[PDB]
Amino acid sequence: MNAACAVDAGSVDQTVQLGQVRTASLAQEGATSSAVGFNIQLNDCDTNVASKAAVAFLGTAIDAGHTNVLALQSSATNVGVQILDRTGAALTLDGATFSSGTNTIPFQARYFATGAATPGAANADATFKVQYQ
Amino acid sequence: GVALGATRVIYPAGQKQEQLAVTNNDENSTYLIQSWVENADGVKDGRFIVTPPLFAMKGKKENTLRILDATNNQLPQDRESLFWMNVKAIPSMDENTLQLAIISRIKLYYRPAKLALPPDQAAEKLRFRRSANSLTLINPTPYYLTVTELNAGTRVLENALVPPMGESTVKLPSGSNITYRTINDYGALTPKMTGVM
């Protein structure tokens, strides 16, 4: 009887707005920007289905040194995007790092510099994996 | 907002096909839908065919996926085999943005036709052995048991997927009274069952 959840990041086409990339905040490797919040919604399902699910992300790392920093799509460089949990903790992009208002999954996103960031726009893609119990 | 019509699929040996509904609840969003079946190793298995493997949903839609047994009767016939049904929703495009595809993963149990034990009796056969710093769940039945709300006395343990005639092993915080629920074929929580470690 129980159906899976209608998943929605943002409001349309799974699109999340990021902040602007200020190079003066990202001048060096290890430098981070301020983090913008976003939510992923698990709609139209039993609240015990949604909560008891295991979620993970999957994307191309910026370099081998930074496997939890998501690369960009060229056009700012020396910088990628990082996704954080509810309290500000980075998450992996290998797609094997689980586990578990109503049915909201709160996230944050921020820029991680891998060096002196050059100006330009930052557009990044990834995949969000929902695996049901 | 792409969703599935179930949280697991039971595929009974002998059926030419199995059906799974996929929906989108959002009139504003447009999705490309890519679907495939993986084994227990997460490797794309040609043993189950999904049609359409690729199609588009422009707005609020419902499409039925057809799951086809292509196993050539080579899977075990005394136990369930675990597979993973994968359905990926790829959104149409758009200023500094993060965009996400969504992969819904659900269990696909190939279930042979002549198992002795009725599926409804499976959960009550689960046994628990205590080790040094861990608890081992022992499954003597031919069915995959999704064990949830596992409690040892007062402490709440991790959720386990105990394979047929096999075992799984969670950690113990270090009670003897065990309670647990499982999820049935309809994706529903069973009542609370008691165990003894």
mmCIF file of C-alpha atoms in Angstrom:
data_model
loop_
_atom_site.group_PDB
_atom_site.id
_atom_site.type_symbol
_atom_site.label_atom_id
_atom_site.label_comp_id
_atom_site.label_asym_id
_atom_site.label_seq_id
_atom_site.Cartn_x
_atom_site.Cartn_y
_atom_site.Cartn_z
ATOM 1 C CA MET A 1 0.000 0.000 0.000
ATOM 2 C CA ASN A 2 2.876 2.398 0.741
ATOM 3 C CA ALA A 3 4.336 4.387 -2.150
ATOM 4 C CA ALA A 4 7.767 5.994 -2.419
ATOM 5 C CA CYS A 5 8.301 9.754 -2.043
ATOM 6 C CA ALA A 6 8.068 12.603 -4.526
ATOM 7 C CA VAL A 7 11.544 14.136 -4.254
ATOM 8 C CA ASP A 8 12.102 17.880 -4.749
ATOM 9 C CA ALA A 9 15.174 20.054 -4.294
ATOM 10 C CA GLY A 10 14.225 23.711 -4.592
ATOM 11 C CA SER A 11 10.935 24.608 -6.278
ATOM 12 C CA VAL A 12 11.473 23.654 -9.917
ATOM 13 C CA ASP A 13 13.559 21.159 -11.896
ATOM 14 C CA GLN A 14 15.593 20.203 -8.818
ATOM 15 C CA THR A 15 17.366 23.554 -9.091
ATOM 16 C CA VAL A 16 19.036 25.145 -6.061
ATOM 17 C CA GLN A 17 20.178 28.777 -6.000
ATOM 18 C CA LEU A 18 23.758 29.388 -4.861
ATOM 19 C CA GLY A 19 25.291 32.584 -3.497
ATOM 20 C CA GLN A 20 27.743 34.651 -5.523
ATOM 21 C CA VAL A 21 31.427 33.682 -5.687
ATOM 22 C CA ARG A 22 33.520 36.398 -4.019
ATOM 23 C CA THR A 23 37.160 35.736 -4.887
ATOM 24 C CA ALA A 24 38.284 37.901 -1.959
ATOM 25 C CA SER A 25 36.797 35.357 0.441
ATOM 26 C CA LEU A 26 38.326 32.415 -1.440
ATOM 27 C CA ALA A 27 41.883 33.648 -1.999
ATOM 28 C CA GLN A 28 43.623 30.427 -0.903
ATOM 29 C CA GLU A 29 43.301 26.648 -0.764
ATOM 30 C CA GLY A 30 41.082 25.556 2.113
ATOM 31 C CA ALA A 31 39.209 28.844 2.060
ATOM 32 C CA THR A 32 35.436 28.569 2.181
ATOM 33 C CA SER A 33 32.580 30.951 1.488
ATOM 34 C CA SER A 34 29.421 31.486 3.488
ATOM 35 C CA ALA A 35 26.994 28.578 3.243
ATOM 36 C CA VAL A 36 23.559 28.892 1.680
ATOM 37 C CA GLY A 37 20.823 26.625 2.982
ATOM 38 C CA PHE A 38 18.540 24.449 0.889
ATOM 39 C CA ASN A 39 16.003 21.711 1.537
ATOM 40 C CA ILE A 40 15.216 18.450 -0.198
ATOM 41 C CA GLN A 41 11.560 17.509 0.170
ATOM 42 C CA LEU A 42 10.263 13.930 0.365
ATOM 43 C CA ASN A 43 6.600 14.569 -0.454
ATOM 44 C CA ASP A 44 3.344 12.666 -0.790
ATOM 45 C CA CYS A 45 4.383 9.723 1.354
ATOM 46 C CA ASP A 46 4.031 8.192 4.814
ATOM 47 C CA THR A 47 6.233 10.066 7.285
ATOM 48 C CA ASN A 48 7.754 6.759 8.396
ATOM 49 C CA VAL A 49 8.804 5.947 4.829
ATOM 50 C CA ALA A 50 10.530 9.291 4.285
ATOM 51 C CA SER A 51 12.371 9.489 7.621
ATOM 52 C CA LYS A 52 13.496 5.848 7.602
ATOM 53 C CA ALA A 53 15.156 6.244 4.199
ATOM 54 C CA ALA A 54 18.883 6.426 3.487
ATOM 55 C CA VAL A 55 20.120 9.325 1.372
ATOM 56 C CA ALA A 56 23.429 10.050 -0.384
ATOM 57 C CA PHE A 57 25.021 12.299 -3.034
ATOM 58 C CA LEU A 58 27.014 11.390 -6.154
ATOM 59 C CA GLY A 59 29.186 13.656 -8.291
ATOM 60 C CA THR A 60 32.560 14.397 -9.853
ATOM 61 C CA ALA A 61 35.148 15.587 -7.327
ATOM 62 C CA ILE A 62 37.091 18.767 -8.090
ATOM 63 C CA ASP A 63 40.382 16.894 -7.690
ATOM 64 C CA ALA A 64 41.753 13.717 -6.076
ATOM 65 C CA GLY A 65 42.629 15.706 -2.969
ATOM 66 C CA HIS A 66 39.056 16.898 -2.457
ATOM 67 C CA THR A 67 36.631 13.991 -2.942
ATOM 68 C CA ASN A 68 33.814 15.791 -1.100
ATOM 69 C CA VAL A 69 34.158 19.005 -3.092
ATOM 70 C CA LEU A 70 31.987 18.942 -6.192
ATOM 71 C CA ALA A 71 33.498 20.293 -9.412
ATOM 72 C CA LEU A 72 32.042 23.021 -11.650
ATOM 73 C CA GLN A 73 30.675 23.273 -15.200
ATOM 74 C CA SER A 74 32.528 25.703 -17.477
ATOM 75 C CA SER A 75 33.429 30.038 -15.378
ATOM 76 C CA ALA A 76 35.214 30.511 -12.045
ATOM 77 C CA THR A 77 38.110 28.143 -11.319
ATOM 78 C CA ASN A 78 40.155 26.834 -8.371
ATOM 79 C CA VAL A 79 36.853 26.277 -6.566
ATOM 80 C CA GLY A 80 33.994 23.797 -6.338
ATOM 81 C CA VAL A 81 30.819 23.216 -4.339
ATOM 82 C CA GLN A 82 30.527 21.333 -1.041
ATOM 83 C CA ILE A 83 27.285 19.967 0.455
ATOM 84 C CA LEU A 84 26.758 19.951 4.226
ATOM 85 C CA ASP A 85 24.209 18.400 6.560
ATOM 86 C CA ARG A 86 21.779 20.229 8.855
ATOM 87 C CA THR A 87 24.516 21.517 11.205
ATOM 88 C CA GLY A 88 27.404 22.218 8.830
ATOM 89 C CA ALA A 89 29.256 18.966 8.094
ATOM 90 C CA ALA A 90 30.491 18.014 4.601
ATOM 91 C CA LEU A 91 29.232 14.852 2.888
ATOM 92 C CA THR A 92 30.819 12.478 0.359
ATOM 93 C CA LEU A 93 30.245 12.244 -3.390
ATOM 94 C CA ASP A 94 31.063 8.565 -3.925
ATOM 95 C CA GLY A 95 27.415 7.568 -3.560
ATOM 96 C CA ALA A 96 28.000 5.114 -0.719
ATOM 97 C CA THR A 97 27.795 7.497 2.246
ATOM 98 C CA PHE A 98 24.365 7.097 3.860
ATOM 99 C CA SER A 99 22.279 6.868 6.221
ATOM 100 C CA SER A 100 19.008 8.266 7.596
ATOM 101 C CA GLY A 101 8.193 20.682 9.135
ATOM 102 C CA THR A 102 7.429 17.196 7.859
ATOM 103 C CA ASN A 103 9.521 15.205 5.387
ATOM 104 C CA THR A 104 12.102 17.978 4.911
ATOM 105 C CA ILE A 105 15.807 17.182 4.622
ATOM 106 C CA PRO A 106 17.773 20.341 5.422
ATOM 107 C CA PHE A 107 21.132 20.870 3.717
ATOM 108 C CA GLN A 108 23.712 23.605 3.222
ATOM 109 C CA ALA A 109 25.998 24.338 0.274
ATOM 110 C CA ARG A 110 29.193 26.409 0.081
ATOM 111 C CA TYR A 111 32.273 27.026 -2.065
ATOM 112 C CA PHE A 112 35.521 25.251 -1.292
ATOM 113 C CA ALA A 113 38.571 26.864 -2.884
ATOM 114 C CA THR A 114 41.427 24.691 -4.118
ATOM 115 C CA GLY A 115 43.599 27.764 -4.612
ATOM 116 C CA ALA A 116 43.370 31.401 -5.669
ATOM 117 C CA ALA A 117 39.843 31.438 -7.055
ATOM 118 C CA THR A 118 39.376 33.232 -10.366
ATOM 119 C CA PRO A 119 36.149 35.227 -10.872
ATOM 120 C CA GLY A 120 33.209 33.825 -12.831
ATOM 121 C CA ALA A 121 29.936 31.969 -12.335
ATOM 122 C CA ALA A 122 29.639 28.676 -10.463
ATOM 123 C CA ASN A 123 27.140 26.161 -11.853
ATOM 124 C CA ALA A 124 27.359 22.631 -10.472
ATOM 125 C CA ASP A 125 25.507 19.373 -11.058
ATOM 126 C CA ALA A 126 25.142 16.239 -8.948
ATOM 127 C CA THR A 127 22.834 13.332 -8.206
ATOM 128 C CA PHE A 128 20.876 12.711 -5.023
ATOM 129 C CA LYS A 129 20.222 9.077 -4.125
ATOM 130 C CA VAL A 130 17.195 7.964 -2.142
ATOM 131 C CA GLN A 131 17.237 4.324 -1.038
ATOM 132 C CA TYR A 132 14.182 3.013 0.750
ATOM 133 C CA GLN A 133 14.142 0.584 3.665
ATOM 134 C CA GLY B 1 8.675 15.557 -7.919
ATOM 135 C CA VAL B 2 9.209 12.031 -9.183
ATOM 136 C CA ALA B 3 7.889 9.178 -7.046
ATOM 137 C CA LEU B 4 7.445 5.410 -7.303
ATOM 138 C CA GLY B 5 4.313 3.356 -6.733
ATOM 139 C CA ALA B 6 6.060 1.115 -4.206
ATOM 140 C CA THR B 7 9.043 0.895 -1.820
ATOM 141 C CA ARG B 8 9.869 -2.678 -2.881
ATOM 142 C CA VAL B 9 8.946 -5.031 -5.719
ATOM 143 C CA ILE B 10 8.195 -8.715 -5.205
ATOM 144 C CA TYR B 11 8.858 -10.615 -8.432
ATOM 145 C CA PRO B 12 7.306 -14.097 -8.270
ATOM 146 C CA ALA B 13 9.087 -16.693 -10.392
ATOM 147 C CA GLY B 14 6.891 -17.512 -13.361
ATOM 148 C CA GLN B 15 5.574 -14.029 -14.148
ATOM 149 C CA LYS B 16 6.353 -12.687 -17.614
ATOM 150 C CA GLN B 17 6.455 -9.173 -16.234
ATOM 151 C CA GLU B 18 6.085 -7.054 -13.126
ATOM 152 C CA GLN B 19 4.687 -3.523 -13.085
ATOM 153 C CA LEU B 20 5.868 -0.436 -11.220
ATOM 154 C CA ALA B 21 4.280 3.011 -11.461
ATOM 155 C CA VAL B 22 6.396 6.173 -11.736
ATOM 156 C CA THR B 23 4.820 9.611 -11.232
ATOM 157 C CA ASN B 24 5.626 13.299 -11.319
ATOM 158 C CA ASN B 25 3.419 15.546 -9.182
ATOM 159 C CA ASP B 26 4.729 18.841 -10.517
ATOM 160 C CA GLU B 27 3.138 20.551 -13.513
ATOM 161 C CA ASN B 28 6.045 23.007 -13.726
ATOM 162 C CA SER B 29 8.882 20.460 -13.946
ATOM 163 C CA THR B 30 10.080 18.312 -16.844
ATOM 164 C CA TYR B 31 12.009 15.072 -16.361
ATOM 165 C CA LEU B 32 13.932 12.546 -18.387
ATOM 166 C CA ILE B 33 13.472 9.170 -16.675
ATOM 167 C CA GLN B 34 16.220 6.549 -16.850
ATOM 168 C CA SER B 35 15.691 3.131 -15.275
ATOM 169 C CA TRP B 36 17.782 0.001 -14.682
ATOM 170 C CA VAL B 37 18.203 -2.992 -12.382
ATOM 171 C CA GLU B 38 21.305 -3.779 -10.317
ATOM 172 C CA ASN B 39 22.221 -6.925 -8.397
ATOM 173 C CA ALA B 40 23.184 -7.065 -4.716
ATOM 174 C CA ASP B 41 26.681 -5.911 -5.718
ATOM 175 C CA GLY B 42 25.370 -2.695 -7.275
ATOM 176 C CA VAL B 43 26.380 -3.941 -10.725
ATOM 177 C CA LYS B 44 24.011 -3.294 -13.631
ATOM 178 C CA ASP B 45 22.403 -6.681 -14.235
ATOM 179 C CA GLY B 46 20.886 -7.710 -17.554
ATOM 180 C CA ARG B 47 18.957 -10.364 -15.653
ATOM 181 C CA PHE B 48 15.984 -7.998 -15.318
ATOM 182 C CA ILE B 49 14.826 -5.814 -18.211
ATOM 183 C CA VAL B 50 13.005 -2.514 -17.687
ATOM 184 C CA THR B 51 10.896 -0.901 -20.415
ATOM 185 C CA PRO B 52 10.842 1.890 -21.182
ATOM 186 C CA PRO B 53 14.479 2.204 -20.069
ATOM 187 C CA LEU B 54 14.279 5.881 -21.001
ATOM 188 C CA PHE B 55 11.354 8.289 -21.467
ATOM 189 C CA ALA B 56 10.229 11.852 -20.708
ATOM 190 C CA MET B 57 7.722 13.360 -18.293
ATOM 191 C CA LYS B 58 6.703 16.905 -19.187
ATOM 192 C CA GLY B 59 4.592 17.890 -16.188
ATOM 193 C CA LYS B 60 2.234 15.981 -13.892
ATOM 194 C CA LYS B 61 2.343 12.440 -15.342
ATOM 195 C CA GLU B 62 2.079 8.763 -14.544
ATOM 196 C CA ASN B 63 4.007 6.094 -16.461
ATOM 197 C CA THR B 64 4.110 2.350 -15.782
ATOM 198 C CA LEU B 65 7.471 0.613 -15.979
ATOM 199 C CA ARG B 66 7.509 -3.032 -17.033
ATOM 200 C CA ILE B 67 9.967 -5.278 -15.216
ATOM 201 C CA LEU B 68 10.875 -8.385 -17.221
ATOM 202 C CA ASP B 69 12.472 -11.598 -15.921
ATOM 203 C CA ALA B 70 15.467 -12.287 -18.155
ATOM 204 C CA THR B 71 17.208 -14.621 -15.681
ATOM 205 C CA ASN B 72 16.876 -17.722 -17.855
ATOM 206 C CA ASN B 73 15.856 -19.582 -14.681
ATOM 207 C CA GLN B 74 19.393 -19.438 -13.287
ATOM 208 C CA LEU B 75 18.746 -17.803 -9.914
ATOM 209 C CA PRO B 76 18.417 -19.877 -6.705
ATOM 210 C CA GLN B 77 15.104 -21.711 -6.305
ATOM 211 C CA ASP B 78 15.155 -22.253 -2.532
ATOM 212 C CA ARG B 79 15.582 -18.593 -1.522
ATOM 213 C CA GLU B 80 14.901 -14.985 -2.522
ATOM 214 C CA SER B 81 17.491 -13.124 -4.592
ATOM 215 C CA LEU B 82 18.151 -9.431 -3.861
ATOM 216 C CA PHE B 83 18.190 -6.946 -6.722
ATOM 217 C CA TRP B 84 17.937 -3.146 -6.766
ATOM 218 C CA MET B 85 15.484 -1.262 -8.964
ATOM 219 C CA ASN B 86 16.928 2.105 -9.976
ATOM 220 C CA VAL B 87 14.900 5.023 -11.346
ATOM 221 C CA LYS B 88 16.735 8.256 -12.180
ATOM 222 C CA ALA B 89 14.899 11.550 -12.731
ATOM 223 C CA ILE B 90 16.888 14.035 -14.784
ATOM 224 C CA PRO B 91 15.445 17.593 -14.677
ATOM 225 C CA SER B 92 15.280 20.021 -17.597
ATOM 226 C CA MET B 93 17.696 22.928 -17.407
ATOM 227 C CA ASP B 94 17.750 26.617 -16.521
ATOM 228 C CA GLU B 95 23.138 32.367 -12.275
ATOM 229 C CA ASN B 96 25.074 30.213 -9.807
ATOM 230 C CA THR B 97 22.958 27.120 -9.262
ATOM 231 C CA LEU B 98 23.189 23.559 -8.026
ATOM 232 C CA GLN B 99 21.031 21.142 -10.030
ATOM 233 C CA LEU B 100 20.266 17.568 -9.001
ATOM 234 C CA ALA B 101 19.124 14.321 -10.590
ATOM 235 C CA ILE B 102 17.270 12.021 -8.218
ATOM 236 C CA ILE B 103 17.881 8.280 -8.039
ATOM 237 C CA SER B 104 15.180 6.287 -6.297
ATOM 238 C CA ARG B 105 16.420 2.872 -5.225
ATOM 239 C CA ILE B 106 14.075 0.116 -4.126
ATOM 240 C CA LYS B 107 14.484 -3.571 -3.359
ATOM 241 C CA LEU B 108 13.601 -6.064 -6.088
ATOM 242 C CA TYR B 109 13.150 -9.545 -4.616
ATOM 243 C CA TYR B 110 13.023 -12.371 -7.123
ATOM 244 C CA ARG B 111 10.844 -14.862 -5.222
ATOM 245 C CA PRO B 112 10.800 -18.552 -6.334
ATOM 246 C CA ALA B 113 7.457 -20.378 -6.566
ATOM 247 C CA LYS B 114 7.777 -23.302 -4.143
ATOM 248 C CA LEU B 115 9.128 -21.997 -0.837
ATOM 249 C CA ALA B 116 7.858 -24.028 2.116
ATOM 250 C CA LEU B 117 7.503 -21.214 4.668
ATOM 251 C CA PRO B 118 4.752 -18.638 3.999
ATOM 252 C CA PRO B 119 6.283 -15.121 3.742
ATOM 253 C CA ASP B 120 4.092 -13.943 6.643
ATOM 254 C CA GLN B 121 5.717 -16.440 9.033
ATOM 255 C CA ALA B 122 9.284 -15.480 8.118
ATOM 256 C CA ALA B 123 9.844 -12.572 10.529
ATOM 257 C CA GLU B 124 9.081 -14.644 13.628
ATOM 258 C CA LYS B 125 11.918 -17.107 12.908
ATOM 259 C CA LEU B 126 14.645 -14.477 13.365
ATOM 260 C CA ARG B 127 17.267 -15.415 15.978
ATOM 261 C CA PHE B 128 19.772 -13.280 17.886
ATOM 262 C CA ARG B 129 23.192 -14.400 19.133
ATOM 263 C CA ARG B 130 25.357 -12.172 21.337
ATOM 264 C CA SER B 131 29.072 -11.882 20.628
ATOM 265 C CA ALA B 132 31.677 -9.798 22.437
ATOM 266 C CA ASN B 133 30.610 -6.290 21.431
ATOM 267 C CA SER B 134 28.012 -7.079 18.774
ATOM 268 C CA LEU B 135 24.641 -8.662 18.053
ATOM 269 C CA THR B 136 24.225 -11.157 15.213
ATOM 270 C CA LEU B 137 20.821 -11.563 13.586
ATOM 271 C CA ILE B 138 20.280 -15.124 12.341
ATOM 272 C CA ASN B 139 17.804 -15.765 9.517
ATOM 273 C CA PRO B 140 16.827 -19.407 8.881
ATOM 274 C CA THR B 141 14.165 -18.506 6.304
ATOM 275 C CA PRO B 142 14.295 -18.155 2.487
ATOM 276 C CA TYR B 143 13.245 -14.457 2.660
ATOM 277 C CA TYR B 144 15.244 -11.237 2.984
ATOM 278 C CA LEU B 145 14.312 -9.671 6.308
ATOM 279 C CA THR B 146 14.414 -5.882 6.573
ATOM 280 C CA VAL B 147 14.767 -5.440 10.328
ATOM 281 C CA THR B 148 13.948 -2.040 11.807
ATOM 282 C CA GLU B 149 13.243 -0.439 15.210
ATOM 283 C CA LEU B 150 15.638 -3.002 16.704
ATOM 284 C CA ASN B 151 15.909 -2.635 20.474
ATOM 285 C CA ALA B 152 18.020 -4.467 23.030
ATOM 286 C CA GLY B 153 16.271 -3.791 26.307
ATOM 287 C CA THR B 154 16.316 -0.001 26.350
ATOM 288 C CA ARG B 155 18.971 0.836 23.748
ATOM 289 C CA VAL B 156 18.066 1.410 20.096
ATOM 290 C CA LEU B 157 20.189 -0.493 17.571
ATOM 291 C CA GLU B 158 20.963 -0.026 13.868
ATOM 292 C CA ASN B 159 18.650 -1.294 11.126
ATOM 293 C CA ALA B 160 19.644 -4.527 9.354
ATOM 294 C CA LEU B 161 18.980 -6.368 6.097
ATOM 295 C CA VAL B 162 19.272 -10.031 7.012
ATOM 296 C CA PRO B 163 19.707 -12.302 3.930
ATOM 297 C CA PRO B 164 17.884 -15.674 3.522
ATOM 298 C CA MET B 165 19.532 -18.548 5.411
ATOM 299 C CA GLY B 166 22.256 -16.049 6.293
ATOM 300 C CA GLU B 167 23.129 -13.405 8.848
ATOM 301 C CA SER B 168 23.872 -9.762 9.583
ATOM 302 C CA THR B 169 25.718 -8.196 12.505
ATOM 303 C CA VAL B 170 25.006 -4.877 14.260
ATOM 304 C CA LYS B 171 26.810 -3.240 17.171
ATOM 305 C CA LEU B 172 25.827 -3.437 20.847
ATOM 306 C CA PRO B 173 26.146 -0.579 23.398
ATOM 307 C CA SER B 174 26.539 -3.084 26.263
ATOM 308 C CA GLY B 175 19.564 -5.551 27.769
ATOM 309 C CA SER B 176 18.545 -9.108 26.880
ATOM 310 C CA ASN B 177 14.927 -8.336 25.972
ATOM 311 C CA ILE B 178 14.821 -7.683 22.234
ATOM 312 C CA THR B 179 12.026 -5.971 20.319
ATOM 313 C CA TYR B 180 11.893 -5.417 16.557
ATOM 314 C CA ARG B 181 9.605 -4.737 13.599
ATOM 315 C CA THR B 182 10.050 -5.704 9.970
ATOM 316 C CA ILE B 183 8.739 -4.309 6.692
ATOM 317 C CA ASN B 184 6.407 -6.599 4.737
ATOM 318 C CA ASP B 185 5.799 -6.990 1.001
ATOM 319 C CA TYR B 186 3.475 -3.984 0.974
ATOM 320 C CA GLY B 187 6.098 -1.729 2.543
ATOM 321 C CA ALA B 188 4.237 -1.723 5.845
ATOM 322 C CA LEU B 189 5.659 -1.967 9.350
ATOM 323 C CA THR B 190 4.728 -5.146 11.209
ATOM 324 C CA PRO B 191 3.699 -4.931 14.877
ATOM 325 C CA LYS B 192 6.363 -5.219 17.591
ATOM 326 C CA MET B 193 7.908 -8.676 17.856
ATOM 327 C CA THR B 194 9.959 -9.928 20.789
ATOM 328 C CA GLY B 195 13.275 -11.767 20.722
ATOM 329 C CA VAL B 196 15.786 -13.426 23.033
ATOM 330 C CA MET B 197 19.536 -12.978 22.587
#
